Design a protein around this ligand. Structure first.
Ligand code: CL
Ligand code: CL
Ligand code: CL
Ligand code: CL
Ligand code: CL
Ligand code: NA
Lengths: 311, 311, 311, 311, 311
């Protein structure tokens, strides 16, 4: 119950590996995801070496309390992971094959700038603090890094689960820390977004454009203002945005533009009626006729500009 | 505290059985369900085998710490199950009969394509990882697989609780893993859906169709746009869909179609008024008269097409 | 740490009692309630017999680990109860008097057919599994069954807390199980329902009926459609129903009828205007005049029919 | 260990005290509040008495396991408190001074009859159960009852934290129970309620009253019905009431009255238009002119009656 | 397992330090934030001093139970922190260097008066209670105080993490207590507040001002009342305020003013129509023309006054 002694001056290498069993509860608002996985740890403790002939066993099994085990922690977790040691195996040379099953709620920042056509890299940071007698360094055993084929997150395509093999070794509170980056790459399943969110939102906006084929101010006021209520109501219904994001998203810009279009359509309807009442029906009719083309064209153009800027 | 030795080279068979005591908290949005059940385990350990004549006991009772017990885990659980060992009995031949009561929040994907006329198969996957000295294989004791008659899930008919007797044996992290599939078959109780969701949603759409028996543009605009607000408001009220499903559901298609119908009804109302104002009342009146039949017929037909496509 | 031996071949009787300290968090949607209570247990274990003279003490106190205690579990709980052993007293004959304070989230189905004039029977099922050496049977000590006078559930009248003295003894997984039914009878406090939910919902419906004293189609369309929006909005506000109940409730039928009435009132308004525009003001005026009586009468009648059918 | 022996036949007095460190999470809907505090306990155990000269110490420190400690529980808690023993000190005469830090979610009924001008008394009930050897009685050490100056509940003024010094001693399940009542007196901070809820609600109602300076039935219908929608929408926004309170509150009565006023204003608007259309403009104009004074006067009067009845 | 003895009569100095690893879940409504950090502790215990020559080691490692460790608690936490002792190192002179990793939900009051242009100071209060044999005093080791560069709170800029080096020593329950103040300074980054909440809210208000270029009372009533509904609906959608803050915020005043402006615009529309109907079109037209300038000017001025008063 002391770290294994060095042969020369070299640090202790703890070979790690995470195998995803379950991925669930991805909360876009909280920027958190719950994970259920295997954590494999491999290191050499020569004090544990044995002759397989004199022992009669090819492998030795130990209880966690019986031998020295490195304190591996996760950096970006809410609380410490719930762990259950599955197996501890010692081969004749003193190599330890530690395996545990754990569950953890991981905190990983999400970039919503390209939502709902966004891809995310979820992070799981492994860490080890170096001790008094010797330095502890983390390594990746890519044979031990993987994910179950049945792993799923609803509304996401899981591209890959990999690790950045080079650890981040740095000093913290006068000791070395070896940090590893495990990455879960996911891309959003944006199909139902068109018929469920985009298309009905566009229909509501198009209804407000019918005011360009009407001279009735009362009917026009009802058209633009009632559709604005319908738009807001629809947004409450589809709740596309989490509590307001601090930065400007792609969908966020489109939505802002839709509010601007409802305001401009009101200005037009107001201008039309005023000119019509102030004995100038030639201008009122020419503006309304221009708007019939101006509104869809300016919308389609601004959308192309936005799609270009974000992608 | 080592696995039982093989008589030849055969793997150890752990006979399993799950008996549902309680089923509750089925969450459609989270795709999870909470279960409270018995887990029975049976395996042969000849080190525990005894002669009854020289021992004088029917069965020997042991504490979990006293003997070797296989590490059975669940694949699709949020956290490790809360277990309470009920009984451990050993018969003269060394057959260990283990029983525990557990509670677990199970993650099982749900198919909403046919909602609210859907049926689901809830899964509970048992798993065992083989050890150094011998391979462990799972089996189903059908006598010990069942459910309490009082087991219920509000709004669901619990059809059956069975297990796929053939385990899924595969290699994972250089060891054999034996997986079992326990299935809970449930079918939704869709009756109150007609009077609570469908019928009021159809009434709001039918109100919009009264615009086909009116020439008043102001009254027509109020009819189609105000019913669209009422439709959206109603959807907020009945909250029939969870946060957006990535795929197209049956109810999802009907709802999309209802939004399309509100848009088409606006187009008609717009066309009719324009023709009337542009001194063409013959064309306007003929369109409105056609719409009176076209709208219910196209709706009833498209619904038949959708119901056919999904079922 | 083995069950007490039988004097003859008789089963071991465990006398139970539950005394409610606090009842809280009744969740109508989840069909669950949280309870805080005393669980008293009593049985004879003659191995614990002592002479009060040689011991000095008239009663002996033990730690739970020191003696055999029956494994009592609750059938309908989310997880196993949080228990705190208050006292364990052994009298010279070997009679054990066990007392624990526990908290548990109990799952009990609720019948909303007569809401908000409903009464419910909340269940707490005690259970004991029989052992190898002897059968265990549960019994009710009525002196030990009760509830604190201050026990409350907001919006409910707590009628009684009793137990069905005859246990339900049955075989499960080749062993006897003795089950007890503890019942908490509650009846809803429906007073504020009239001024808070019923009356404002009726006012909105009555506003729609003012269209029967108007010939203005535009004002009538605004009356019936805007009140329909107000009705839906009001329902969102008072959120009277949990996520859709699988069965048809009393309030559910009234609400369905209110939607039907808004649809019929639209049909009338549509018919009246069509007859007026189609040069038939005699027929239009006679329908509108009939509706003035027909609508309140048919409503009042259908409500009497519904109240009769449900109660 | 067993309870300290009586010198005569007197019960054991356990002097208590609670010092609030943190008060947080006051939930009006659940009628629950979370508390973080010190629990001090003092009693005399002559078996623990010592000579400070022969011992060399003026005070003795013990571990909880080393000595007898009374089992103090809280009556109105969700689950048993999370406790951490801070200190146990024994003086030469055998006086035990126990101190622990605990956190607990307390269940305390709230009276909303005078909301938002309400004051509440939050309760924390301490309890001790007597043993066969001797009766245990609770007492209040007022020097030990207090609260941190920084203790706060947002939107509340914390008046005082005191205890009812006389315990409630009663028999329960054949043993004496001594109960103490700790009271946290709080009064609501109702200032932002005027500009945030009342004034905008009143504005909407006043907007409906402008229909008394208009003869346009279409404009009047839009005024009263659209403001009713705005009123309902506003109440959804400010969510002033928890899930329906079983009793009639002050705000509840005002809100009911506001719905009644919207109904009466519709009746007036209906009556005025009917009289106008039925060639009686003298009667219509006289009603509308009366309403201009009748509506604000009846409102202001009924509000005075309500304020009087509730306060 | 007794505190270290004083060389003279001096109190024991416990040098503290907190290093933020993760900061997450800042809840504005609850006034809480979850933190994951290192807690370093250092004090002198001469009973632990050793000769590095006779021992062979330069540093000694101990288990928490092997030595005396001061009981450090946090004042403003929901429950006691989840702690995991990382390392305990003793140097030859008896200096103990303790390190633990903890997670805690911290309660810290938030000032929303300047939202969303507000800055907050989050507090973490360390505390130690003095013992019988000697007084314990806290100190700050600034070398051990810091935060990870990757530490983030979405929508916030983390300015600094520091500690007030002078402890607050006071008396509590007859013992001296030493308290430390750790401060996390954060400033709200809400780049998107203007486009996401302000501008759509101003557009709705501006739409209501188009009633100043219209004489149609029916169109004006629809303009001001429908925009009021749109405003309320928008506020339900953007949910900018937590459950009503007891004090008046900056955004709170702006929103109150917006409701006042909707009321004044209704008064104008009412006055204008009354004057028109009461054969005074000169006075009506002059008011409406004044309002065109009066409304934006009074709005822009009052906003400058508010921005001045709050900042
Ligand atoms: Cl961890
Ligand atoms: Cl498990
Ligand atoms: Cl239980
Ligand atoms: Cl407690
Ligand atoms: Cl703490
Ligand atoms: Na309208």
């Amino acid at each position: 119950v002391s770290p294994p002694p060095p042969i020369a001056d070299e640090p202790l290498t703890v070979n790690t590996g995470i195998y995803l069993i379950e991925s669930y509860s991805l909360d876009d608002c909280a920027e958190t995801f719950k994970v259920n996985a295997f954590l494999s740890l491999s290191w050499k403790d020569r004090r544990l070496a044995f002759d397989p002939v004199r022992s009669g066993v090819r492998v030795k099994t130990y209880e966690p309390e019986a031998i020295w085990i490195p304190e591996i922690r996760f950096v970006n977790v809410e609380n410490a992971r719930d762990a259950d040691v599955v197996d501890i195996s010692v081969s004749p040379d003193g190599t330890v094959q530690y395996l545990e099953r754990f569950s953890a709620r991981v905190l990983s920042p999400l970039d919503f700038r390209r939502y709902p056509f966004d891809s995310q890299t979820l992070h799981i940071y492994l860490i080890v603090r170096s001790v008094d007698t010797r330095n502890i360094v983390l390594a990746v055993d890519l044979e031990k890094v993987g994910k179950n084929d049945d792993v799923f997150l609803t509304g996401w395509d899981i591209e890959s689960f990999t690790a950045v093999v080079k650890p981040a070794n740095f000093a913290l509170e006068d000791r070395l820390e070896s940090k590893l980056d495990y990455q879960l790459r996911i891309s959003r399943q944006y199909f139902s977004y068109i018929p469920n969110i985009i298309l009905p939102m566009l229909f509501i906006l198009f209804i407000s454009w019918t005011a360009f084929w009407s001279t009735s101010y009362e009917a026009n006021v009802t058209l633009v203002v009632s559709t604005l209520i319908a738009h807001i109501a629809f947004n409450i219904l589809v709740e596309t945005n989490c509590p307001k994001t601090p930065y400007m998203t792609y969908t966020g810009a489109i939505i802002f533009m839709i509010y601007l279009f409802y305001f401009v359509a009101v200005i037009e309807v107001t201008v039309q009626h005023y000119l019509k009442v102030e004995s100038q029906p030639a201008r009122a009719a020419s503006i309304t006729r221009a708007s019939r083309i101006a509104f869809p064209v300016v919308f389609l153009l601004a959308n192309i500009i936005l799609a270009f800027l974000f992608f």
